[PDB]
Design an enzyme around this catalytic site. Sequence first.
Site, mmCIF file in Angstrom:
data_model
loop_
_atom_site.group_PDB
_atom_site.id
_atom_site.type_symbol
_atom_site.label_atom_id
_atom_site.label_comp_id
_atom_site.label_asym_id
_atom_site.label_seq_id
_atom_site.Cartn_x
_atom_site.Cartn_y
_atom_site.Cartn_z
ATOM 1 N N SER B 92 -15.566 -10.622 11.644
ATOM 2 C CA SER B 92 -16.444 -9.732 10.884
ATOM 3 C C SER B 92 -17.868 -10.302 10.821
ATOM 4 C CB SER B 92 -15.873 -9.466 9.473
ATOM 5 O OG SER B 92 -16.448 -8.314 8.907
ATOM 6 N N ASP B 193 -10.993 0.785 13.470
ATOM 7 C CA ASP B 193 -11.613 -0.069 12.456
ATOM 8 C C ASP B 193 -12.296 0.773 11.375
ATOM 9 O OD1 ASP B 193 -13.297 -2.002 11.088
ATOM 10 O OD2 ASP B 193 -13.058 -3.328 12.806
ATOM 11 N N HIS B 223 -9.492 -3.556 10.933
ATOM 12 C CA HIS B 223 -10.635 -4.486 10.860
ATOM 13 C C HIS B 223 -10.251 -5.958 10.692
ATOM 14 C CE1 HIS B 223 -14.575 -6.106 10.064
ATOM 15 N NE2 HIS B 223 -14.182 -6.527 8.879
#
Lengths: 250, 252
Positions: B92, B193, B223
């Site tokens: 991320s 995602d 995600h």
Amino acid sequence: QVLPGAEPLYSVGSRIGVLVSHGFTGSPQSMRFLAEGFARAGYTVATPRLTGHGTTPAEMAASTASDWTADIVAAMRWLEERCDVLFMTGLSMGGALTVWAAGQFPERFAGIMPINAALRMESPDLAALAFNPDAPAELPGIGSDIKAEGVKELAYPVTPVPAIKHLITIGAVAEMLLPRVKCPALIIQSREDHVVPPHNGELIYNGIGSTEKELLWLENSYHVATLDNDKELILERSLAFIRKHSKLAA
Amino acid sequence: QVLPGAEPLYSVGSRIGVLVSHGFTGSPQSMRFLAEGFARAGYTVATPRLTGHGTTPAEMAASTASDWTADIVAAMRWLEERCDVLFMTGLSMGGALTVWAAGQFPERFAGIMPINAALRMESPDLAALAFNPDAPAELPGIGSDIKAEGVKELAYPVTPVPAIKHLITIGAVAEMLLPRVKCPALIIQSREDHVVPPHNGELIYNGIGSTEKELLWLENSYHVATLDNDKELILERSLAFIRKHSKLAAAL
Ligand SMILES: [Br-]
Ligand SMILES: [Br-]
């Protein structure tokens, strides 16, 4: 102390206001021709001097994107005491601020005029300085990018490195808010810019939510256009923009 | 006080180092499968606790992008103490720090594995909170986007508003640095995602000057993929990668 020619410029006028924003490392003086032309069709005019600007490069090194956005918002407040209709224009980072204001406050402004807005610097060398531990405090400045002869811009001679990140953030935030910008837009972008990739103009055009948008390509100007020789035209075309959309005095 | 299960994972081993970065409002816990994987496969490993993370949202609200880049730097220098081949991986925002690092230190890295790099969030609403004078202090958090029934990440319940800008800054700096990443890259983006737009992978593969680049779509996860179904697949595909590019990995 404030460097001479870089003082802020606020003229009192009708119930129509223009917010006029300078760029990064620059001062209001790069803007002083344009702001003056507004104050003379009578509009109330605010041309703030961003924090850290027009004083010392070390004071700029301690200024943030929170500061600059707060400087814009204080300038709106001031205007909103005196006006029912507002407009914003800016150059470079000041143009990124314009796109930010219109998007942060979706309904506040009747129209905007971003000129050479610094949305995407598109420069890896600049990004390498944003969080570089070993970088030197200062670098060469980026001002005076003008076609006209002998025309200086009052802008710092150094780029204070620890402020670079903040320039990038405003550009990025501004670009991410493009869909929310609803007001009419007259996007001003030099055909040749040695500072900001002129693909920024087209980025904005395709991005904004507005249905009252027009792109105006400059032709005898570089980056710092408000001082260039394509400048009288900007003031001119801008005034015709204000009028068509304000509908008051006018 | 550091919350239970969010402490950093600093593990010793060979001359090949792996830095492993977690995400925004996240903690090491969400990376503990990966890291303990690498520690086990010989390598020295650093899995730092990003400043303001794993304690309180209020502390995070006071932390900046400067802090987090400096945290990655500090961990990187801790590896260099004992290592001469370095690799980076992150999830991320950890993904964006990975790409940032590779571009900030062009020569320093043998390879990167960004997982769902948070480079362009492409949300107007989040941007309108970046510099909002009259925004609340807290919004609902973004944690736990996992396709896998019964599996929960240890992320703050809220998203502290003042930290949002720093998230975007990191994303944007990384983006602008893609041309300078030239090292071997394993780009691991989910196909589904709900936190970061999955077209970010594509944005990277066509963005880097790297010439040894591979885009790897996840198909059974969301995600927070380092915990999803494919966490095992990722650890495995990453070892092949490290083993392929180091050649100082001899492992029985
Ligand atoms: Br509004
Ligand atoms: Br390097």
